[PDB]
Design a protein around this ligand. Structure first.
Ligand SMILES: NC(=O)c1ccc[n+]([C@@H]2O[C@H](COP(=O)([O-])OP(=O)(O)OC[C@H]3O[C@@H](n4cnc5c(N)ncnc54)[C@H](OP(=O)(O)O)[C@@H]3O)[C@@H](O)[C@H]2O)c1
Ligand SMILES: NC(=O)c1ccc[n+]([C@@H]2O[C@H](COP(=O)([O-])OP(=O)(O)OC[C@H]3O[C@@H](n4cnc5c(N)ncnc54)[C@H](OP(=O)(O)O)[C@@H]3O)[C@@H](O)[C@H]2O)c1
Lengths: 296, 296
C-alpha cells in the first residue's frame, strides 16, 4: 500500500519520523523540521504532537504507521523496554517498516541492548545505529549536542546531515553498541560530577558561604564541570525541574554497573551514585532533575 | 637590629617573603618576582632556592630571618602542622616578625586552622589572611589562579596587587577562615570530579573504546570538568606525576569531613573519596597526582 506525499520528498531517502517528544525529543525533532528532514512524529501522549501538527508534520497513529512513511526512524524514549515496545510491539515499527529503513536509537540504554535491537531488527531487513547524546536539554534546544554513534560506518556517513541538524560534534565510536558504550562512560562522569556539585553546595551552605561567591569560584579551574554549568543556576534558585530526570540517571547507572560486573571492573563511585539515585527514585523524586539530589 | 636594603623598597610596605617553593610555590613566587614584590625566599630544601638566588632574591636561613626583612610573608607549605612549624617553631616567623607584618597562608587546611593561626599570630601583633587557591599547577604557572580569601577586608584590598601577580580572579570570601572554607567546598568538587574521570576511563578501557574519541567526547557537555581538562592528557599518556599530590587531597578531605561532622552534614561521596585517597597513600602512591587514582 502506497501513500500520499508528505513534507519530505521520497526521493531524498531522507524522510525522518521521530518517536518520543520529551524533554530532549521535542527540541531534537524541531531541529530536524527546521532542517527539512522531519516528515512525521509519534508520541504516546498525543498532545505533545500538537506543535508539530501545526507546522504540517504528519502525526502517526502508531510507530508502524509512522515507519511506513519514512526512511529513518529516530527514537528518543526513556528506557530499553520502552524502545522494545515502540520497535517490536503489536503496532511497533517492525509492523510497518519496509526493508532498508534505518532505526536510530538516540536514547540511553546499553551496548548489549543496542546489539539486541540491531539483531532483532535485522530479521526484518531494518538497519540500526545507536546514537546517544550528551549536552542536556540545553544542548538539544541549542542544537549543539555531542552525538556518539555505533553501527555501520557507511550509515554514519549517510546520516551525518541528520545528526548535524541536531548536534555539533558528531563522533563515530565504532560498531553497534559502541555509541551506548561511550554514553555509559559519559554517565559515570556526569553522575559523579553531579554528586560533586551537590555535596560541595551542601558544605557551602553549612559553612554559611555567600552563594554568589561560591558560584563564581566553582565556575572555574578545575572544580568547574558541565553539571555546574548546566545546573548550578537552577539549583541555587531552587528549581529542581529536569533537565535530566533522576530516574533516567538511575537507569543509566544500572547499565554501567552491569557492564562493570561483566568485565571485572570495580567502580565504587558509580556504585554509590547508583545507590543515591535509586534512593531518590524510591523517595518519589525520580522525575526531578539529577541536580536535585540532596535537596529534594 | 636594622638591615641592609633588598630587592624591594621598604617604603613600599609591600616587600614579600615566600616560604615553600614547591609545585605551586615556585611558580607563584616567580610571578611575585616578575611583578617586583619578591624580596626573599625560604625553603627547607635549600636547592630549590637556587633559581631565586640567581635572580638576586635573598635566601633566608630560617622563617624568622625572612620575616625580619619583609612586610608580607606568604606560606605555601603542605599541611597545617607544616604551617605551625614555619610560623611558630623555634626559628619561625614569629621569632623575627615585627608588629604589623602580615602573614598570608595560601596552602590548604581548614577554617578552624586559619582561625587558630590568626589568633596565635595576633598575640605578636601579626595580621593574617587565609588565601588558598584553585587552578592547579597549570594555573600557578600561568598566573591565572583563582584565589579565595578570608580575613580583614581592608587587608584584602591592600594586598590585591600581590594577589593579582599570582592569580586572575581574586575573591574575598569573608572573615578569617572563610577562604579555607571555600577551598574545602572546592575540594569536595575536585575530588569527586576526579573520581568521576578515573572511573569513566576505567570503564572506557574495559569497553575497548578508542581513547582519542573518549577524550573528545568527555572534553564536552556536560561530562567535561576541570579535572578532565587539567589531567586527562597526562593520564592517557601514563604520566602519573603531580600535578596535585594524592596525599594532599587526602588531607583536604579529612578537613572536609571534620567540618561536615561538626555541622551535621552527610557527604557520602566525600567520605568515599577520602577512603580512596587514604588507601592510595597507604599503598605508597601519596606523591602521585590525584589523577593516578585507579591507575597506580
Ligand atoms: N534530559 C536529558 O538531559 C538527557 C540527555 C541525554 C540523554 N537523555 C536520554 O534520552 C532519553 C529521553 O530523555 P528525556 O529527557 O527526553 O525524557 P522524557 O522527557 O521523560 O521523555 C521521554 C519520552 O519518551 C516517551 N516514552 C517513554 N516511554 C514510552 C513508551 N513505553 N512508549 C512510548 N513512548 C514512550 C515519552 O512519552 P510521553 O510524552 O507520552 O510521556 C516521552 O516522549 C532518555 O533515555 C534519557 O536518559 C536525556
Ligand atoms: N598542587 C596543586 O595542584 C595545588 C593546588 C592548590 C593548592 N594546593 C595546596 O597547596 C599547598 C602546597 O602544594 P604543592 O603542590 O606546592 O606541594 P609540594 O609540591 O609538595 O610543596 C610543598 C612545599 O612545602 C614545603 N614544606 C612542607 N612541609 C614543610 C615543613 N614542615 N617545613 C618547611 N617547609 C615545608 C616543601 O619543602 P621541600 O621543598 O623542602 O619539600 C615544599 O616547598 C598544599 O597545601 C596543597 O594542598 C596544591
Amino acid at each position: 500500500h502506497h501513500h500520499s506525499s508528505g513534507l519530505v520528498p521520497r526521493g531524498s531517502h531522507m524522510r525522518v519520523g521521530f518517536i518520543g517528544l520529551g524533554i530532549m525529543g521535542g527540541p531534537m525533532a524541531t531541529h530536524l523540521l527546521k532542517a527539512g528532514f522531519l516528515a512525521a512524529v509519534y508520541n504516546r501522549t498525543r498532545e505533545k504532537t500538537k506543535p508539530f501538527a501545526e507546522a504540517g508534520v504528519y502525526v502517526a497513529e502508531s510507530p508502524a504507521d509512522l515507519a511506513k512513511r519514512v526512511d529513518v526512524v529516530i527514537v528518543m524514549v526513556s528506557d530499553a523496554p520502552d524502545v522494545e515496545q515502540v520497535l517490536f510491539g503489536p503496532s511497533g515499527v517492525v509492523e510497518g517498516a519496509r526493508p532498508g529503513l534505518i532505526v536510530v536509537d538516540m536514547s540511553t540504554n546499553s551496548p548489549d541492548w543496542a546489539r539486541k535491537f540491531a539483531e532483532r531488527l535485522a530479521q526484518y531487513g531494518i538497519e540500526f545505529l545507536d546514537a546517544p547524546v550528551t549536552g542536556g536539554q540545553k544542548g538539544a534546544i541549542e542544537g549543539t549536542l555531542t552525538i556518539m554513534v555505533g553501527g555501520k560506518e557507511e550509515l554514519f556517513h549517510r546520516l551525518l546531515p541528520i545528526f548535524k541538524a541536531m548536534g555539533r560534534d558528531i563522533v563515530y565510536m565504532g560498531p553497534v553498541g559502541y555509541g551506548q558504550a561511550m554514553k555509559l562512560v559519559n554517565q559515570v562522569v556526569v553522575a559523579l560530577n553531579t554528586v560533586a556539585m551537590v555535596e560541595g553546595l551542601k558544605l557551602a551552605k553549612a559553612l554559611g558561604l555567600d552563594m554568589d561567591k561560591v558560584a563564581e569560584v566553582l565556575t572555574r579551574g578545575a572544580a568547574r564541570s558541565g553539571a555546574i554549568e548546566l545546573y548550578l543556576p537552577k539549583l541555587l534558585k531552587g528549581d529542581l525541574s529536569p533537565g535530566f530526570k533522576a530516574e533516567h540517571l538511575k537507569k543509566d547507572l544500572g547499565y554501567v554497573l552491569e557492564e562493570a560486573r561483566k568485565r571485572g571492573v570495580k567502580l565504587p563511585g558509580a556504585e554509590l551514585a547508583y545507590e543515591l539515585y535509586r534512593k531518590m527514585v524510591e523517595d518519589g523524586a525520580g522525575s526531578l532533575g539529577i541536580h536535585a539530589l540532596g535537596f529534594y
